[PDB]
Amino acid sequence: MNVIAILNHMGVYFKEEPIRELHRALERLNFQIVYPNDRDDLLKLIENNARLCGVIFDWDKYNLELCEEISKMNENLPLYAFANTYSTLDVSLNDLRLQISFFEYALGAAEDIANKIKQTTDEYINTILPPLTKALFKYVREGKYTFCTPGHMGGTAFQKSPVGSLFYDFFGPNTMKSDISISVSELGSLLDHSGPHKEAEQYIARVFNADRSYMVTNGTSTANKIVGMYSAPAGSTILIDRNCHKSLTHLMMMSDVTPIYFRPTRNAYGILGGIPQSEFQHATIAKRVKETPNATWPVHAVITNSTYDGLLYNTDFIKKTLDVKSIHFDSAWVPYTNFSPIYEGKCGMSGGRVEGKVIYETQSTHKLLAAFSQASMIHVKGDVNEETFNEAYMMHTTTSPHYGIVASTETAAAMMKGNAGKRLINGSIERAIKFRKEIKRLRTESDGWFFDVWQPDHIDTTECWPLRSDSTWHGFKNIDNEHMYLDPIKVTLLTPGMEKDGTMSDFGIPASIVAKYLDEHGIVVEKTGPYNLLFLFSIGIDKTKALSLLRALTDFKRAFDLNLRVKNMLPSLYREDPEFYENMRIQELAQNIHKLIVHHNLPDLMYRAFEVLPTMVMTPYAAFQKELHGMTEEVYLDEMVGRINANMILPYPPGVPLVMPGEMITEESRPVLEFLQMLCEIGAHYPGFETDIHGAYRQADGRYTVKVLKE
Amino acid sequence: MNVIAILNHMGVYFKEEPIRELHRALERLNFQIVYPNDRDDLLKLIENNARLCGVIFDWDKYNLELCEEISKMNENLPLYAFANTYSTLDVSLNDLRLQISFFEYALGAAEDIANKIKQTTDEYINTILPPLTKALFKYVREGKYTFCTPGHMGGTAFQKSPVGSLFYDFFGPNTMKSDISISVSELGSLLDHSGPHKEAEQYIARVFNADRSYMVTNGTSTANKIVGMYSAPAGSTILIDRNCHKSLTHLMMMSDVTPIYFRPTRNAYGILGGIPQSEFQHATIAKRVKETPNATWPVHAVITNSTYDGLLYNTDFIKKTLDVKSIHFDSAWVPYTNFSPIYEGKCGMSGGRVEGKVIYETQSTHKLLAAFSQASMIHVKGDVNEETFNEAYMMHTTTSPHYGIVASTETAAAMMKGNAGKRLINGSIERAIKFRKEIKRLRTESDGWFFDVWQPDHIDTTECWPLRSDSTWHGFKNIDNEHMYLDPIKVTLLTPGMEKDGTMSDFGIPASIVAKYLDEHGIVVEKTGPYNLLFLFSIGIDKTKALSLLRALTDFKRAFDLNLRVKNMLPSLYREDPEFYENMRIQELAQNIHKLIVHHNLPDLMYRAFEVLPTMVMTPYAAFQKELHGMTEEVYLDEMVGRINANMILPYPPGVPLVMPGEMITEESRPVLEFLQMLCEIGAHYPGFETDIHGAYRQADGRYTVKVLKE
Amino acid sequence: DMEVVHISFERSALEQWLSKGGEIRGKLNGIGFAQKLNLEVDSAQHLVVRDVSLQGSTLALP
Ligand SMILES: *Cc1c(COP(=O)(O)O)cnc(C)c1O
Numbered sequence A, B: 001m002n003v004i005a006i007l008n009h010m011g012v013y014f015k016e017e018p019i020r021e022l023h024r025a026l027e028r029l030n031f032q033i034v035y036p037n038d039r040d041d042l043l044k045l046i047e048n049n050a051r052l053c054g055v056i057f058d059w060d061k062y063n064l065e066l067c068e069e070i071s072k073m074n075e076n077l078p079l080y081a082f083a084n085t086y087s088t089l090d091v092s093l094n095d096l097r098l099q100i101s102f103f104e105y106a107l108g109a110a111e112d113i114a115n116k117i118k119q120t121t122d123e124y125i126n127t128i129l130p131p132l133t134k135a136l137f138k139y140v141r142e143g144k145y146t147f148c149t150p151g152h153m154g155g156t157a158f159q160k161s162p163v164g165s166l167f168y169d170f171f172g173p174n175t176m177k178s179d180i181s182i183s184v185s186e187l188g189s190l191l192d193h194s195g196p197h198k199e200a201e202q203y204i205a206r207v208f209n210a211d212r213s214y215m216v217t218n219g220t221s222t223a224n225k226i227v228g229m230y231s232a233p234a235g236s237t238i239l240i241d242r243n244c245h246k247s248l249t250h251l252m253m254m255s256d257v258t259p260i261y262f263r264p265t266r267n268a269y270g271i272l273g274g275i276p277q278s279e280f281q282h283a284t285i286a287k288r289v290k291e292t293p294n295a296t297w298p299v300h301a302v303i304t305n306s307t308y309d310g311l312l313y314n315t316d317f318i319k320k321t322l323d324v325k326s327i328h329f330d331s332a333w334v335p336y337t338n339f340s341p342i343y344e345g346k347c348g349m350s351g352g353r354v355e356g357k358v359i360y361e362t363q364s365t366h367k368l369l370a371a372f373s374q375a376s377m378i379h380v381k382g383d384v385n386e387e388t389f390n391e392a393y394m395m396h397t398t399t400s401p402h403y404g405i406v407a408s409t410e411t412a413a414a415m416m417k418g419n420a421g422k423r424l425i426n427g428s429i430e431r432a433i434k435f436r437k438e439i440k441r442l443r444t445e446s447d448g449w450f451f452d453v454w455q456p457d458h459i460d461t462t463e464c465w466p467l468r469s470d471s472t473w474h475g476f477k478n479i480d481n482e483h484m485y486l487d488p489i490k491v492t493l494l495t496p497g498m499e500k501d502g503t504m505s506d507f508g509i510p511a512s513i514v515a516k517y518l519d520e521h522g523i524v525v526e527k528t529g530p531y532n533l534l535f536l537f538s539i540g541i542d543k544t545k546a547l548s549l550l551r552a553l554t555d556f557k558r559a560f561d562l563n564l565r566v567k568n569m570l571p572s573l574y575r576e577d578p579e580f581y582e583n584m585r586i587q588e589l590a591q592n593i594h595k596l597i598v599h600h601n602l603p604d605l606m607y608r609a610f611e612v613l614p615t616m617v618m619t620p621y622a623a624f625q626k627e628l629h630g631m632t633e634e635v636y637l638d639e640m641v642g643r644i645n646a647n648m649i650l651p652y653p654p655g656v657p658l659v660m661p662g663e664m665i666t667e668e669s670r671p672v673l674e675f676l677q678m679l680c681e682i683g684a685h686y687p688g689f690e691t692d693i694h695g696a697y698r699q700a701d702g703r704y705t706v707k708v709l710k711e
Numbered sequence C: 001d002m003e004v005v006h007i008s009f010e011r012s013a014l015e016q017w018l019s020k021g022g023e024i025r026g027k028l029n030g031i032g033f034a035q036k037l038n039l040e041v042d043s044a045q046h047l048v049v050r051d052v053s054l055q056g057s058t059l060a061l062p
């Protein structure tokens, strides 16, 4: 932060001479001087250059063309405008947040002007930064306390060992001095939630529109366990969603509760839909209470909003129909549904305080923002118990937290306030819609097959596309209107291979082959499997990473139409088995895999293995108690009908659990077992495309074995 | 002072080559070289740049466009014009004060030209400076007289102590070397009135239009006590104004005199008017002599012109109607009513010597000018005894005056002499009138409430607006025409909240909240309280300090219309009581205070309290005699009817005295006691706006105590 | 618009206002309906009852 801009040239000498004298004075305090051209030149030095804090221009030249565009991008940006004798303000400059610093054209006083700019810049740093981060940066340059934890003490022990000097010189002197425990009085303690930590939690809740936001120092996987132990005593009933995460599985195995699983919707490509509105009714929930032994009235509900793919729900209908006093919204993928007008009334924070209820949100911080790992937030909107949830937080958080993660967790909330933060959410949406239009433009004009985006036929508007009932792009049988929305930044690429009715085709290329080609250039695919893709276009994805993805997609069509070799295209796949992948081309491998999907019939077995839920015998908590006592055995995959599994089956593809730890596969869940045996045959002929199922151990013959419970 | 200007590039080589040779010669003697462009470029290098002393231009190019505009600014400014063979003067260049130094275009003679410029520059320094300041600067570089006072002797003792080096290195070496006393022979003594001090007193009185003037080195508060003890024997009668100063009250407590208080005019906003023309009559003054026990013919009259708000009177009517041989004018706020044609006949110095009378004025020097603190003057206009008035001046001035303030006291009289000083007095008026028009322009065009300037509806002139009897902006009933004047550089912002008839309204914001909002940016209101905002637009307020005030006023309307919080607007007020000022906004605090003013009825309990006067039992000099003997006691505020106070009550707001030391509250001054009890209730509910009365001590219960005398 | 010397509150309604918040309803002089009052918390752990004139009154138990 040391860029000073000097716009325009009046051509006279009594105004340019103070500029030349100030040019030699600002360089003595480490400041970069730039000379923009016209009005459009200064506008490009703010959006692309964020390290700018000084704008020098003539007040009697552009008093309305600069005080309006800059105010739409930053509010606290200092404006070192130079006024004259006959200078005044404008009536259209009253409702604009600006910081104008007036000066004169006096000779010899250039040294006093440089001291005022440095002090004004210091005031800008101490204002935009939160009091927790500001106190951490000031403690390094002044606070030098001894006999404290940890033992390194700002990197002192590393300066006495040859191996320690290499680890200290990698980061920096300011990095080790910022890692302090609760051994500091002027910064407070995180466990006590007082002093600087008290105002830090209230600052994030005001930015993200919440009551009292929290700062988890262990990650999102831990925040879901602390909240889950609140509205679930030793013997209750919760309404957990079927599309759960690995962290949510351990929550049901550590609490003696009776969960009730829902039945979300889905199509044939593998895109996870949502829970219908019929499941949120009062007669539907009460019907499953009597059918499930040892289950009372549900006191907690877990809703995954949004899912792993990227489909939001309608909170305006759930907060009125779902009669649950503790509704959870796992917002681990949408940390931005607030700073945009096309995201109003879609999450738990948008709206008023629902009486008699409470909203929980575990928004991931180190996923689609900018902070260190093991960071999360807890958004509470309602009335909770004071002497209950406090004990649940200390059971998973150490007494000496790492303030380096806390300083970055609150920083992401500070990067959203103002026009400088609002352009990050809207900027990623404009780059996403532009990328969606480039696919349809390069599809008709091209000569042959081309990728397709799972989007409606009309993407001219700039909002969330609703999933209506008179459309054919979503492919969901009987979907509720005004309930399922589309995420613009979550671009879902559909590879040609299936039809619009849910069947197969002769010419098709699986998405697993394209995912291996993108990894060669450095593009990591988030979700892949049958005939679908997924990418993350958050605020950190600039225009370079967006345009580089389309170039990698156009190169796949050129290498496939010309019929090239695998060795001259996929060097990583060739090193796995050079003997088998010798005389094989790119067209021979793409056609042999496509015939295996039609032969084994993947879309039909996958769609029927997820709707029919297996019979849950006991609670997931009782299944873990038998494992510690030594009552587990390993059986074959073909010999398990009528047994209780011990682990959770997570086949890739897709990415949702199959059998919960504690269920039994009987005659009703027959297609469920057929889905596991089908992946073992299709993923065993060609190297590199092996079967990936979390829970199935590979032996020495090919048959996978699972861990079940003894009878 | 080392700026040399070179105007007009002829394009030829025989004229530009001597310029290049002179460029390398003037830099050897520390001189800055500038190159203006056109004719308007040189004009901007004089008004804004005051460190210029050399103008080089072609005489045969602009002989009439430069010798006229420069002469209107600085007369003794050297002009290094270069003439040619066929060069001559003009008939219109005879009545102009200029200093033109001709030269030639000779090669190799650039060294001799540089010696002539340095010698001419030294002549300009030895001319614009007074002989007292010239002897002070010469004694620093050449005076080496040892064994003198003070003991530091230019900072010798500071170089031997570790703590003394920090105090000496802050100001500078030349700062302590000028701190000399009367231990110098070539500078004389101030008490002796000889040598350089004798010519200094005649130089100040000649510029300020006076016969004899001194240099008070203890502020204006001390100069008022020296004059008051010159024409007021023990047991006489003085005519002191009611709107007096803290120092004017102590003058009545140091001399056994019988004062007679006047009845100044006032409105409802708190702005005090002036003394009516009926009080200066002969039948009005003589009537109060018989009613007041122990009172003879008044021999001295103290008139506060102008007051604290800045309202000039009419000296053309007082010097003929008021029959006082010693009329005093407290000119502590107008040290400039002479250097402008819109101030003729408004002070005591303007005009001539009154036959049989004498005029005394205490023009402040450090108030609204440019000099060190504790500096005042005594302007004497008449025939007084020199051997008698000299002994009274030594009663409050030490024998070793501080020449650092004396040099700046005479400097203010030299900075205003000539056309160079008239551009600062008239320049501050033009900047004040321009600021007055920017308020009315941003009031009608705005959408909502806006600040108002206490000025007439027609301000399309550059003079003192008279307070007529057919106007409603001033709100002074029974006002005398051609007696009340307005100071253009005294802009009084009237915050909305009251009507034009003197009653109250429904929507308004008090001036106490705005006073603290301006403090965050570095703006302190001179006078605030009810619904007024007084500011000082003297010579120290340039175009930067004037335009910075308008921007802060527009930010208050934006923050109030959007309804912001107190913590996110007033951080200084939030630190006083974070618990009470937690869930409070800017609109909730502005409306609760406005209802307390209407409920307690402030304009009525303040106008009627200042109108009536308590019964003065004894003289103020007799009240101080009983305090030294120990006959004082502290009583409650509610129990004091019929007692004699010991100190002067100065409640804030406003800023004028209430009860003089030596008065008694009977049944006539009933509203006077009600004004003190009303401020104790309104200033206790909300923190920050506590009751400020210089005389009321705060206890541990809330009730204030006063200091009275024993019965 | 009437004087009062004792105010009675309900135990089943006092625990809800001091935990969840909102507004409290209490009758006057043991008669009438549970009218709404301007009851707040004190810095010295008391119960300040506010009226139409912004006056404070610390409650106490017999
Ligand atoms: C990725 C993810 C997590 C894990 O996030 P971490 O902060 O790395 O622990 C937890 N829950 C869901 C729904 C996730 O998608």
Ligand SMILES: *Cc1c(COP(=O)(O)O)cnc(C)c1O
Pocket: B218, B219, B220, B221, B222, B245, B247, B308, B330, B332, B333, B364, B366, B374, B375, B376
């Ligand atoms: C400010 C003031 C004074 C005090 O001025 P100093 O130079 O500081 O002594 C005295 N009289 C009046 C009327 C003042 O306004």
